Amino acid sequence: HMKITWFGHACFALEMEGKTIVTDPFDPIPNVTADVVTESHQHNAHHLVKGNFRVIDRPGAYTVNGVKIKGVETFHDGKNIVFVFEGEGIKVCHLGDLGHVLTPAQVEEIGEIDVLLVPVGGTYTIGPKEAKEVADLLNAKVIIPMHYKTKYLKFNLLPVDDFLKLFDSYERVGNILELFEKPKERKVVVMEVQ
């Protein structure tokens, strides 16, 4: 069992193993108690998250509270760290602001993913076709797009519909996705804040 909550932008709370991971928090304020906070790139976003958390903002292999976490740098000149969370026999991947299709090394290091959080807006990150290519490289089952056109953030960002048209089906949910078993099949899930 696990629960994913979207707070907007690239900020999600993942619950697995009686622990909570928050990715890429920002300044409606995420009102949540975390064990881990990860940051795909440097910038203090996380001074309003609660709990006595471990902040992870560098690549490598970590074990925090019985969850295995792995950071993989995909760019460094700023930077982009992809994080992989392994818990309850489910592997979750947050791709950050991934700007290029993963290299063979990076695919090899990330491995097969069960739940993929993938940017699809196209200028500042990869676009829709490259996101599907990455999803395929990682054999992703549940795919959650992010970093697309919203009401107030729109300049040079493609709509999520451009990604959705590349798949046979999809589902829309609210701000929470719960998984009660390891995903057997591929499903694109579009979340919504609220």
- Residue 104 near residue 92, CB atoms below 8 Å: no
Indicate which technique resolved this structure: X-ray
User: What gap in Å lies between CA 102 and CA 133, rounded to an integer?
Assistant: 9
- Residue 158 near residue 148, CB atoms below 8 Å: yes
Resolution in Å, one decimal place: 2.0
- Tally Cβ neighbours within 10 Å of residue 124: 12
- Specify the number of domains making up the chain: 1
Tokens of 58: 């560098």
User: What gap in Å lies between CA 41 and CA 51, rounded to an integer?
Assistant: 21
- Residue 81 near residue 58, CB atoms below 8 Å: yes
Tokens of 135: 């999803």
Give just the sign of the alpha carbon dihedral 145, 143, 117, 194.
positive
- Residue 12 near residue 23, CB atoms below 8 Å: yes
From the list 22, 1, 18, 28, the residue with the least C-alpha distance to 10 is: 22
Q: Domain holding 153: CATH number?
A: 3.60.15.10
- Tally Cβ neighbours within 10 Å of residue 30: 22
For the sheet containing 11-16, what is the strand order?
54-56, 36-38, 19-23, 11-16, 2-8, 176-179
Full 3-state SS string of 55-69: EECCCEEEEECCEEE
Strands 115-119 and 11-16, by their bridges, are: unpaired
Full 3-state SS string of the chain: CEEEEEEECCEEEEEECCEEEEECCCCCCCCCECCEEECCCCCCHHHHCECCCEEECCCEEEEECCEEEEEEEEEECCEEEEEEEEECCEEEEECCCCCCCCCHHHHHHHCCCCEEEEECCCCCCCCHHHHHHHHHHCCCCEEEEECCCCCCCCCCCCCCHHHHCCCCCCEECCCEEEECCCCCCCEEEECCCC
Q: What is the domain range of residue 89?
A: 1-194
